[PDB]
Design an enzyme around this catalytic site. Structure first.
Site, PDB file in Angstrom:
ATOM      1  N   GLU C  45     145.714 104.594  88.676  1.00  0.00           N
ATOM      2  CA  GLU C  45     145.751 103.329  87.949  1.00  0.00           C
ATOM      3  C   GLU C  45     146.694 103.455  86.755  1.00  0.00           C
ATOM      4  O   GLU C  45     146.581 104.410  85.986  1.00  0.00           O
ATOM      5  CB  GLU C  45     144.334 102.991  87.437  1.00  0.00           C
ATOM      6  CG  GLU C  45     144.232 101.714  86.601  1.00  0.00           C
ATOM      7  CD  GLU C  45     143.020 101.661  85.674  1.00  0.00           C
ATOM      8  OE1 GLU C  45     142.420 102.721  85.405  1.00  0.00           O
ATOM      9  OE2 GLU C  45     142.662 100.558  85.203  1.00  0.00           O
ATOM     10  N   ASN C 108     146.658  94.122  85.576  1.00  0.00           N
ATOM     11  CA  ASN C 108     146.513  95.527  85.969  1.00  0.00           C
ATOM     12  C   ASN C 108     146.634  95.589  87.498  1.00  0.00           C
ATOM     13  O   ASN C 108     145.735  95.170  88.214  1.00  0.00           O
ATOM     14  CB  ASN C 108     145.127  96.021  85.537  1.00  0.00           C
ATOM     15  CG  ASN C 108     144.969  97.518  85.657  1.00  0.00           C
ATOM     16  OD1 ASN C 108     145.535  98.146  86.563  1.00  0.00           O
ATOM     17  ND2 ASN C 108     144.178  98.108  84.739  1.00  0.00           N
ATOM     18  N   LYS C 125     143.649  93.892  89.422  1.00  0.00           N
ATOM     19  CA  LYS C 125     142.271  94.240  89.044  1.00  0.00           C
ATOM     20  C   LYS C 125     141.419  93.029  88.691  1.00  0.00           C
ATOM     21  O   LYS C 125     141.762  92.258  87.781  1.00  0.00           O
ATOM     22  CB  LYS C 125     142.271  95.254  87.893  1.00  0.00           C
ATOM     23  CG  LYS C 125     140.930  95.973  87.680  1.00  0.00           C
ATOM     24  CD  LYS C 125     140.870  96.628  86.293  1.00  0.00           C
ATOM     25  CE  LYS C 125     140.178  97.986  86.317  1.00  0.00           C
ATOM     26  NZ  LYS C 125     140.415  98.855  85.083  1.00  0.00           N
ATOM     27  N   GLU C 144     140.913  96.322  77.903  1.00  0.00           N
ATOM     28  CA  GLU C 144     141.408  95.709  79.141  1.00  0.00           C
ATOM     29  C   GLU C 144     141.192  94.193  79.169  1.00  0.00           C
ATOM     30  O   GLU C 144     142.041  93.460  79.657  1.00  0.00           O
ATOM     31  CB  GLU C 144     140.807  96.373  80.395  1.00  0.00           C
ATOM     32  CG  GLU C 144     141.295  97.815  80.607  1.00  0.00           C
ATOM     33  CD  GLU C 144     140.891  98.409  81.950  1.00  0.00           C
ATOM     34  OE1 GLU C 144     141.301  97.852  83.000  1.00  0.00           O
ATOM     35  OE2 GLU C 144     140.183  99.445  81.953  1.00  0.00           O
ATOM     36  N   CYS C 170     140.213 101.246  89.347  1.00  0.00           N
ATOM     37  CA  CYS C 170     139.275 101.777  88.363  1.00  0.00           C
ATOM     38  C   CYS C 170     137.853 101.200  88.426  1.00  0.00           C
ATOM     39  O   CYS C 170     137.086 101.543  89.320  1.00  0.00           O
ATOM     40  CB  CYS C 170     139.839 101.627  86.944  1.00  0.00           C
ATOM     41  SG  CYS C 170     138.859 102.515  85.701  1.00  0.00           S
ATOM     42  N   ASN C 195     141.354 105.483  85.275  1.00  0.00           N
ATOM     43  CA  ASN C 195     141.290 106.161  83.991  1.00  0.00           C
ATOM     44  C   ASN C 195     139.863 105.996  83.472  1.00  0.00           C
ATOM     45  O   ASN C 195     139.533 104.946  82.920  1.00  0.00           O
ATOM     46  CB  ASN C 195     142.245 105.503  82.995  1.00  0.00           C
ATOM     47  CG  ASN C 195     143.713 105.650  83.389  1.00  0.00           C
ATOM     48  OD1 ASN C 195     144.402 106.562  82.925  1.00  0.00           O
ATOM     49  ND2 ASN C 195     144.198 104.742  84.225  1.00  0.00           N
TER      50      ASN C 195
END
Lengths: 302, 302, 302, 302
Positions: C45, C108, C125, C144, C170, C195
């Site tokens: 990611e 993302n 994402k 995020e 993730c 991560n």
């Protein structure tokens, strides 16, 4: 042949939390342990103090203050009286300070006390982890090698009410020799406590493996010895250092049958049939039938 | 200092299947392995035949047929010849028959062969599981104690190319003493094979732990000795009896880095760095710093 | 129908490390992978930059620096050309910045690229973790929800060469709905990067469970959907923040068939057989045979 | 807001073991439950009879004899009278036969009974496993699809004394939907029984994963919904067929806090803090914050 075993896990003890307050916390757990039908309870390594080996000491007087010069002294006596009266056995960890001809002996110690408050057995930590002198890079020290001598009692096994019991302390659990010596002495329960930081300064790449290594060691030692086992941690954020949780009771098959989920004072319990040891020790690990100690010589060399 | 290690797991070998067909299978797995950058491959226990200790043999000549009188013989040489050209070391398990001074000796054997095709070391199985005489109460027999005598080589560690390698065979893996003797000799890889049934007639309440007890043993032996390890299974339904899957490669931290999922001929692989051993052996498991062998004598007593 | 799948785990990427240096690293894992018969490799990611969502940014041009405005840019083209040349496909994650109808959209994002070097599918994402505005009690930030908006593609499943592949990113791995939507679209490999810090500021009493939850999620996602999976982490100590290792490939039975042990650039591999999903999808988890979606309505409500 | 949750695991029930004798066995597990300080105990799926769905029935009256037509009847009533007198809640599984205008309804059923012996909720198994017609090759059959119709109550959650509780039955636990529906209705404890053969004839290459798949389902369901869970199995060798042990209690973190170790009747307990669910449900799995149900529609399609 039957019984209920408990682990009394501890949350942090602060640097100046007194022994009276710690014994109080111990006493509460002993009650929570009559309320669950417990016969014998396992307490952590160095259960009466914060984990002083994390600091570098310059002052002898200040260091000695973390040790017991008697067992029990007046302050720790209510723990013994109450557990007798309640009919509960226990394993207690503490720093033992002994004076011999004016020479000072330091040990990382645990005792077995039976249903009647008798001390029936002692063990002194043989495998001391950490390092011998101050290391400036470390967020916390691990100076067990300075503050304690390796135990001189061996790995004995003792008759505790109806159970043959063996003690280990903390790091000891990670050495097959600990387990095996007591395994060959017929231990039905092997128990002890630990303080296990979740961070390791020189080998930080294994931090995320802390629980794994701990549980692995307990499970395999139990299995390969056909022994019940218990590990009582002191855990949580203690004087700024994270201590590992996951205190456990484990069956002679290496199956974890009880586990803690909090980072605080916590009692867990499990039923033990002393005869279950047979499923391993009369069959796959029938020592007398299968072991070949003549080829194990290298283990005992020094 | 770096290599790719592989486990060559085998599916069942039937009674009437020939060594030439088995060698065939072994050659393909070797072929797939050079495919994937492999430098060294681990093959099962008694990789050349069905698991004969399952039956009671009254005819000596037919029992004798399952053994090798030489290594390699005609049928087996091509497995050797290939790997010597593909520059690929292996571990092979087989039943060994040798006559010495009037005695017909039977061993459960494995050998390390190097890159330059040279047999560098032998090991003969020290811990034999099962029983000595026929047992009617058992649905299938386990007569390893009858068909083999305990190995006469101890637990050697050999330089194979750049790696210090030790062997185990099957039940050996469940004995901390196997691992410790080799860990004390600086083994960086401990490897071997197994035939592990998922049913155990005497303690069938453990049948559902077969994987657990197998993997527990591997992960823990590896960790507490800082050794890489590999376990090559012969697996699946063989002559009416189910053999355990889950061949594996394991890191010195006790993490499984490679596991099989089929009950068939299957190659798994992993990168090994021989220096990772140091993360355990120079630190938490620094034998010199931490071991206290004056307290371990009982392990060596006989 | 059969392939060799791979995960290319990344060590830390510094704030001062250029995209070019990162590409060069990625290119080495490609070379390593080809070396080992790999047809497809999964990268982490946000693979091209340090994990910037850990800081609070006030200057915008510098926040934007961490984003890609095209895929590939000149800097990243070499990774596309090499993999294409090597016949190896990949899953690459990165920060995507797209401007449409007066709006600066931030995603993302991950992409699937086939052997031929064609971008065959994109995912953005959907389950963003962390917080929207700067928070005081935090030893590091996890923004995020501020730097990315929830992806707008749903959970697509794409044909990549001969495989039906779905992506997650993730935190998505921890939601059964991520897996079940792609499971229902017949995905055979579900793959993606991550991560995952080993400390969580809101609930630090689960830090010792970081690897447990990562592993549990993957295994169970695979088991219950009959899917092969792989999770590529960017790992180790990055700008003060410790990130979880344990990149894994997982079989449709939920067995981990490959696992990283370092906290650095590391390649793990495993053979996949797309027909193995059948063992679950045609039997215990035959969806059409067994599911009862009339009762699943609450899961769809919003 | 705190309680003790037990699991009363059952050993085999003989084909001709009377309900009076089973009830007796159940009654004794209360005993063990009261002695360890228990508030609610969970009993197995179909806890009143042997597991009849393993046989091919051709006589309807014989089949009917395994179902209950009232709950309780005189014979089961002592189970209710006691725990009311004694103040424990239970989860009991059984075969429900109902007659609706001369039409026979057949359900695999569980009920929650509170501290006062009142039935406060019902669940009927929705995910019926196995096969619908006789198969000659099988050692034992699995004809649940024939002897039961799928449940018509969906997955409700019920207040039981102080706790919000959800039921699953057996194979249900392997479906994320089961868990997610009750998690969305705020279940604090999700519980049920099971009968899980360690052998599956259509896919026997997963027999050695039986414990893994079971434990894995319970742990991940609990983790991902922030719920405490309990799975009470009927276990051991029942009418020639070996049923899986490992009854368990799981915390909202996915951690197993109790585990059975015998294949006989057995009580396990664990301390339940109903507000611990907030560790997940007010943070990482803060549904209302993180879920994106407009992207989950496929899950509810039929």
């Amino acid at each position: 042949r039957q019984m209920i075993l408990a682990v009394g896990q501890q949350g942090p003890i602060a640097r100046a939390e007194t022994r009276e307050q710690v014994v109080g916390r111990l006493l509460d757990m002993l009650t929570n342990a009559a309320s669950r039908g417990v016969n014998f309870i396992v307490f952590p390594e160095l259960a009466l103090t914060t984990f002083f080996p994390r600091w570098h000491f310059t002052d002898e007087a200040e260091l000695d203050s973390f040790y017991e010069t008697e067992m029990p002294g007046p302050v720790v006596r209510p723990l013994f009286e109450t557990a007798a009266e309640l009919g509960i056995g226990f394993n207690l960890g503490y720093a033992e300070l002994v004076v011999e001809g004016g020479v000072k002996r330091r040990f990382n110690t645990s005792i077995l006390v039976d249903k009647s408050g008798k001390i029936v057995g002692k063990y002194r930590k043989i495998h001391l982890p950490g390092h011998k002198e101050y290391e400036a890079y470390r967020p916390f020290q691990h100076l067990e090698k300075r503050y304690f001598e390796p135990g001189d009692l061996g790995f004995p096994v003792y008759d505790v009410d109806a159970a043959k019991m063996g003690m280990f302390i903390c790091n000891d659990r990670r050495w097959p020799e600990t387990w095996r010596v007591m395994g060959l002495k017929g231990a039905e329960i092997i128990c002890g406590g630990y303080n296990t930081p979740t961070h390791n300064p020189p080998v930080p790449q294994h931090d995320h493996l802390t629980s794994f290594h701990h549980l692995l060691s307990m499970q395999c030692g139990s299995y390969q010895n056909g022994a019940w086992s218990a590990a009582a941690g002191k855990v949580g954020m203690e004087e700024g250092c994270m201590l590992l949780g996951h205190s456990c009771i484990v069956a002679p098959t290496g199956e974890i049958v009880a586990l803690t989920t909090t980072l605080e004072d916590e009692v867990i319990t499990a039923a033990l049939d002393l005869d279950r040891c047979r499923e391993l020790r009369e069959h796959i690990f029938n020592f007398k039938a299968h072991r070949q100690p003549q080829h194990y010589g290298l283990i005992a060399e020094f």
